[PDB]
Amino acid sequence: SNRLDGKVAIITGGTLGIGLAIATKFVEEGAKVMITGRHSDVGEKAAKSVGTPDQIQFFQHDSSDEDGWTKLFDATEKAFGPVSTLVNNAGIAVNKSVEETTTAEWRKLLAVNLDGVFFGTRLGIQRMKNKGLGASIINMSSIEGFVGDPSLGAYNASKGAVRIMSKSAALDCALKDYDVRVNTVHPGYIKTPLVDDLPGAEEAMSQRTKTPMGHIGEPNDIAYICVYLASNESKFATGSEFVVDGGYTAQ
Amino acid sequence: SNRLDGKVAIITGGTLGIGLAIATKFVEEGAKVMITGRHSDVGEKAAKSVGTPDQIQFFQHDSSDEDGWTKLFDATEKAFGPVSTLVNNAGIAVNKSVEETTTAEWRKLLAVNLDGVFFGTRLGIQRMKNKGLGASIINMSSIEGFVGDPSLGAYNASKGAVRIMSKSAALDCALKDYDVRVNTVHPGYIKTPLVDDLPGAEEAMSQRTKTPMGHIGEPNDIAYICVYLASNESKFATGSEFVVDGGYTAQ
Amino acid sequence: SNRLDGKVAIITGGTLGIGLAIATKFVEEGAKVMITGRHSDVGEKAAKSVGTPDQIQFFQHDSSDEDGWTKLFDATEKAFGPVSTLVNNAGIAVNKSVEETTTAEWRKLLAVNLDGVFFGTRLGIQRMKNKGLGASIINMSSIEGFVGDPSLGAYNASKGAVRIMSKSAALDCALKDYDVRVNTVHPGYIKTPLVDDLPGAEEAMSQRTKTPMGHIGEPNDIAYICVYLASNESKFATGSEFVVDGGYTAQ
Amino acid sequence: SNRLDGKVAIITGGTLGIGLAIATKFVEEGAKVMITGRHSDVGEKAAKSVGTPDQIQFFQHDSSDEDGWTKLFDATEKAFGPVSTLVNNAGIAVNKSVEETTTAEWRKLLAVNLDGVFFGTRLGIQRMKNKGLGASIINMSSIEGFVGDPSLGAYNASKGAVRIMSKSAALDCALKDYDVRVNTVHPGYIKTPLVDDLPGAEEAMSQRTKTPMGHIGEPNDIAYICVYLASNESKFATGSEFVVDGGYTAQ
Ligand SMILES: [Mg+2]
Ligand SMILES: [Mg+2]
């Protein structure tokens, strides 16, 4: 409680699944939150389900939209004050090998998963540096930033890019005394309403050869490690990878 | 607050520096703690400085002493109840290259840093498995588990051994549904009264070529990530490495 | 000698520095080589300096040009036979932090360093699979695929993407018994005529805090590890990272 | 051919399997070799099967025997000249979880796999430094230096220790301009007469969930990467990990 007192957070893809859980715990801990998403009717209902407009609001945004990132920071500023916290959580996945990826699939996945993260990090540094905010940029990666999957080629590429680009930004902010930290969070398989919509998916994911615990995780498993990284508890952590994956990458 | 409600923790080397901070935060969050150390007068005073005997007690133990590990678990059991949490934090360091390490230095450093951790992990699994405790074994490693240091040969070996042996134990517990998690924590350079006792040490450690933040950390920086791993917030994390190092291993 | 007997290799960016050394050793060991580059006068002179047209030829190509990759494989096929070996070595670097990267710099660097590698790998698999060739795709990464550099943001992102996308492709080829291997090579700082053109560069690179050997390497240091990976000596290596960096990433 | 001209190599555990293949290729490439082993009748027959006493000889040694390491270097010196190359390849394995490891199993496995490597590396540096030899210490690790196995607890610990202790030694030698390199080699599952002696072993090892290639490797797969590291081709590689594992650690 009150672990995120005074923080102002943006969370991209914050209307569903992982990102909505992070938003929920960020509010329980005293943060003010702006969540983004592509659809207004889902996003306004999501934001109302968590709290009141003095706590959490919704902004319609495609994270691949460069100019929209500026509007998003302005609106959060106008609504809640200077932003201290950015969680680049919006992503999309394509189920193709490298061999079978079309160039339109490639470009479309990188625009969201890699350009978007770049645009959010670049603008985050510019807007949060040198303000005594205890600023933190949590860049959502995944186990596929560590290990390959034969059927997630373009995804593997985007999550490996975000893993190492985040270490570049972390160093620059640390060396220039910007008072910004940058870290990546790497979920394993997490249960979400989307997974529930794929018969047998969670079953395949829960096999011991994939997830040693024999089950998959839940959205709050990721929300709790983002709380830690958003708060001043983690003021000495930057450039690091935080894995919550049920044992996946240990074997 | 109350993030560690009901937990029973042992912390080795818990009378000083990092381990005493972990003990302190473990008590603030509702855990019952037994700290160990080699000297009674320091350990009884340390334990009294944190709280009352219903909260925290001291047990005299050298972590390289196999038979003493049994006494330690029994006494914690008798005092506080079944143990749910073990932090293998006791260690010693030798400032020698591999070339200049004597065999007595080698054996003496491995008895504490590697045998001790083994004895604590082995007995932890045996005593905590299959009890619905939400058991967690936090094995203290360090950045020297990732990267070499020309003047910490035997240390590098012990912290690399603990890094990978902890992943073995994590898998076995996960696959056998033991309800035990095992993880490693890797501090960078941390300020402790011992460091303060070395003129110019912290100065050398704080140089940007070592620690990009330009400063070193503090004991609570490690206590907060142990709280996270001791609690049920991290129930989906096992076999993973958690680095709090100011950027050291990012460059 | 004759370690690359019968192999047919494409090497992108093969007219200069690292890529020209790889081409040279590939020819000394019995491979037939096609090198690419952006300028005909340099590329025709480079190719003539190594050997005769029955051994090595030049093809004008920008690796970011998708359609040109098809022409390149056809022409190599027509000239030398079925391709067994692809070295995605062409790259460009931008000396900017993430904070100071413009979007045109970002896109331009990713088109060469990441799209290009994708196009070469995707087409390599399609053209080399299932032909008993002992096919090998060596994807040129660098130490910046492992660690961040505060002034190479977009570069770090491209080399982290190539590191993990190569593991995806390696698995798919292995699981489908394609007889293709995919691996990444990670040079540290290497002396090239370009570096010689930056007064004080090599001096800054050779400092012990960067390169522990106190010097930087030479192009042949990378050519010898590509020989190993192009040949059947490495038929059990796939999805792995091979680092030749003077100690850079060890500390 | 002649890639190891003038080199003088010791290979521990060099009478069988992996180590005997390394010895064989080291001789084919012009090196003089001393192999060690615990049994004279196997070791003298092995050494005779490779070549004549001017090329390769056998020395009876337990690598856990400190004082014997001195005799071994002296005898190689007397027989072949100053040693340039050490391959710490002798090891033993115990098939137990951390939970089920007895302390005698623990100590016995660490004496060979970790003390032995220490003794060989420490004495190697002392005897090979500053002699213009192009000295190379190849420390045999394995995939279990990267990832855990639920039934190889003490093994995981020894191979993680050797992975990181080798980086310490590599840095010290590089910084002091000793003309010694230190690297680790990490085989995956390799077919040896011992494996052939376990019905169904290779079958279990060759499953795609373990080894993506669907088969295991052969001893020469490790011999060829040791050739590369023993020779001056790799003069810019130190502190690095070289993995030949069929894809095991890529997924
Ligand atoms: Mg480093
Ligand atoms: Mg794995």
Short mmCIF file of C-alpha atoms in Angstrom, two decimals, chain A residues 64 66 96-103 106-107 110 114-115 118-119 121-122 125-126 129 144-154 156-165 167-169 171-172 175-176 178 241, chain C residues 64 66 96-103 106-107 110 114-115 118-119 121-122 125-126 129 144-154 156-165 167-169 171-172 175-176 178 241:
data_model
loop_
_atom_site.label_atom_id
_atom_site.label_comp_id
_atom_site.label_asym_id
_atom_site.label_seq_id
_atom_site.Cartn_x
_atom_site.Cartn_y
_atom_site.Cartn_z
CA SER A 64 2.91 2.55 -33.70
CA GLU A 66 4.50 8.47 -33.63
CA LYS A 96 4.79 -17.77 -38.39
CA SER A 97 8.31 -19.05 -38.83
CA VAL A 98 10.94 -16.76 -40.28
CA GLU A 99 10.67 -18.82 -43.48
CA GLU A 100 6.91 -18.16 -43.74
CA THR A 101 6.77 -14.52 -42.66
CA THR A 102 5.52 -12.15 -45.34
CA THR A 103 7.04 -8.70 -45.47
CA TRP A 106 7.07 -8.38 -40.61
CA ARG A 107 6.58 -4.62 -40.93
CA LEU A 110 7.74 -4.37 -35.86
CA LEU A 114 9.60 -2.33 -31.83
CA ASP A 115 8.92 1.11 -33.34
CA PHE A 118 11.24 3.13 -29.38
CA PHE A 119 8.80 6.07 -29.70
CA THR A 121 11.12 5.28 -24.68
CA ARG A 122 12.59 8.18 -26.69
CA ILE A 125 13.42 10.14 -21.61
CA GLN A 126 12.88 13.60 -23.09
CA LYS A 129 14.61 13.43 -17.38
CA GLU A 144 10.95 -14.88 -26.42
CA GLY A 145 13.52 -12.15 -25.82
CA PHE A 146 15.84 -14.85 -24.46
CA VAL A 147 15.03 -17.99 -26.45
CA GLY A 148 13.81 -18.73 -29.93
CA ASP A 149 10.48 -20.19 -30.88
CA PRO A 150 10.29 -21.88 -34.32
CA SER A 151 6.85 -20.30 -34.95
CA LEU A 152 7.42 -16.75 -33.58
CA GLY A 153 10.17 -15.38 -35.88
CA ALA A 154 9.20 -11.71 -36.10
CA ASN A 156 11.53 -13.14 -31.33
CA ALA A 157 13.18 -10.33 -33.30
CA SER A 158 11.09 -7.59 -31.70
CA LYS A 159 11.58 -8.93 -28.15
CA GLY A 160 15.32 -9.35 -28.61
CA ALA A 161 15.54 -5.82 -29.99
CA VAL A 162 13.62 -4.41 -27.01
CA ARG A 163 15.80 -6.36 -24.56
CA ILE A 164 19.07 -4.82 -25.77
CA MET A 165 17.79 -1.37 -26.82
CA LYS A 167 20.07 -1.50 -21.94
CA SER A 168 21.39 1.28 -24.21
CA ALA A 169 18.78 3.73 -22.89
CA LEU A 171 23.11 3.42 -19.56
CA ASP A 172 22.69 6.84 -21.18
CA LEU A 175 25.59 8.25 -17.10
CA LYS A 176 23.91 11.64 -17.69
CA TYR A 178 18.77 11.84 -15.80
CA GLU A 241 15.99 -8.25 -17.21
CA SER C 64 17.73 -3.58 -47.64
CA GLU C 66 14.03 -7.14 -50.98
CA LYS C 96 23.26 8.47 -31.42
CA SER C 97 21.57 7.70 -28.13
CA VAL C 98 18.00 6.46 -28.14
CA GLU C 99 17.02 9.93 -26.90
CA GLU C 100 18.67 11.61 -29.91
CA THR C 101 17.73 9.18 -32.68
CA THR C 102 15.52 10.67 -35.37
CA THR C 103 12.92 8.44 -36.94
CA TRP C 106 15.98 4.66 -36.97
CA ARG C 107 14.25 3.39 -40.11
CA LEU C 110 16.85 -1.06 -39.34
CA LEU C 114 17.50 -5.90 -39.47
CA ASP C 115 15.23 -6.05 -42.54
CA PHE C 118 15.58 -11.05 -42.36
CA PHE C 119 15.35 -11.01 -46.18
CA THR C 121 17.74 -15.50 -43.87
CA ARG C 122 14.18 -16.04 -45.12
CA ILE C 125 16.15 -21.14 -45.84
CA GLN C 126 13.81 -21.39 -48.83
CA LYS C 129 16.71 -26.39 -47.34
CA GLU C 144 26.34 -4.75 -29.03
CA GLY C 145 23.96 -7.69 -29.33
CA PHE C 146 24.83 -8.56 -25.73
CA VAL C 147 25.48 -5.22 -24.00
CA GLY C 148 24.21 -1.71 -24.39
CA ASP C 149 26.17 1.28 -25.55
CA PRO C 150 24.81 4.71 -24.55
CA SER C 151 25.59 6.09 -28.04
CA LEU C 152 24.48 3.15 -30.26
CA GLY C 153 20.72 2.91 -29.53
CA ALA C 154 19.37 1.83 -32.91
CA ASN C 156 21.90 -2.17 -30.12
CA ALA C 157 18.30 -2.81 -31.19
CA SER C 158 19.25 -4.27 -34.56
CA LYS C 159 21.97 -6.52 -33.11
CA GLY C 160 19.73 -7.78 -30.31
CA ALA C 161 17.00 -8.49 -32.85
CA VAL C 162 19.40 -10.45 -35.07
CA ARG C 163 20.72 -12.41 -32.07
CA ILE C 164 17.31 -13.79 -31.08
CA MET C 165 15.69 -14.00 -34.54
CA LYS C 167 17.70 -18.66 -32.76
CA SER C 168 14.11 -18.90 -34.03
CA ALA C 169 15.30 -19.77 -37.54
CA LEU C 171 15.20 -24.18 -34.30
CA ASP C 172 12.72 -24.36 -37.19
CA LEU C 175 13.10 -29.45 -36.16
CA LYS C 176 12.05 -29.78 -39.82
CA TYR C 178 16.15 -28.82 -43.34
CA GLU C 241 26.42 -17.09 -30.27
#
